[PDB]
Amino acid sequence: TAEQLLREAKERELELLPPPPQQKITDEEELNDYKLRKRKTFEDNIRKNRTVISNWIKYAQWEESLKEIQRARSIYERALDVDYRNITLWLKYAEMEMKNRQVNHARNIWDRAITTLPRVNQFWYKYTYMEEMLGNVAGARQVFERWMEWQPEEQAWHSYINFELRYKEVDRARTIYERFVLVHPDVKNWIKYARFEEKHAYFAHARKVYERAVEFFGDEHMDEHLYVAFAKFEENQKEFERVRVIYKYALDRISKQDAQELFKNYTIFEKKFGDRRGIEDII
């Protein structure tokens, strides 16, 4: 214990010098000369390694701090001009320009990043930040055109349709949800459109779209796809004909009735709901 403790005391006394913070911001332009020496040290540190991330980030923080706009925009513009890939750094510089009081060149710079590599990360995230900042109808329009241009999405598309739906009206978000769901059909998209259409009242186009979507997506067996929607609209509207048709179509499913417990718990749910008791439901 005396060896480790002695190493703790000697290590604690091994620090080299305290700071000498004297004459802080004094003698008028002398502070600007100290800022010129510090900016020179940062320029030499960024000069030692052209691939340096850290030093560039510190030059961006100290820049935006003491360099106001011009020289700060020169640091973010030089580092941004020296960085093509690794768009996360472009998101750091975009966040530094977003904190400025202008924000016009920050939004236009966000559009320049949209024309740049989208990465499907900083484009949707930065687009959501700009749209949340201002330009509701415009930001959702360019974000919907961009997201509708290169590839579809899942959490970004569903979250974009949710934010566009809660914004003002769900009318346009219904057609956009039908186009996005039609671009990448799946059971989750049918359940989402059936849930939003369920909270939308209606349900005529939700049931017709449920049968039409269940018919076009049929390949091997329905299982959690059609039976979940048939039970949702069934138990929602309390229709025995839809429960009997769903139970009849579920019995025709291949691959050992598709999922065992799924169709069993669903047939027991609609069974117990509709009639149950003995006789038929017992056999």
């Binding site: 201002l134 360019q142 989750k188 989402k192």
Partner: protein
Amino acid sequence: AAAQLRQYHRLTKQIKPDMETYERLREKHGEEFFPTSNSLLHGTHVPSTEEIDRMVIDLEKQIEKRDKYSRRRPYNDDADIDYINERNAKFNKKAERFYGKYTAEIKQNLERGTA
């Protein structure tokens, strides 16, 4: 997995996906943290150019310094949320170390020892 729904509740997350996950949960927490607004009055400011995604004019007048401060508030909120990472959580035990690098080597050494 789960696509979308209408609800707000607690979750777990905080997992390896990192950037994409923290940005999705950060945008969802930011959107759910900010409710709707006066856009009905902007519904008077609404007229004929709304739909037709491809835009004729993407700039116009913006809004005002109002939306500038209201835009600066979530920036400071994201700065305060970014300022939360871990705590000091220190003590005097076992042997000594040298600055940060020895503590990082102690954490990685503890990660390699337990397997």
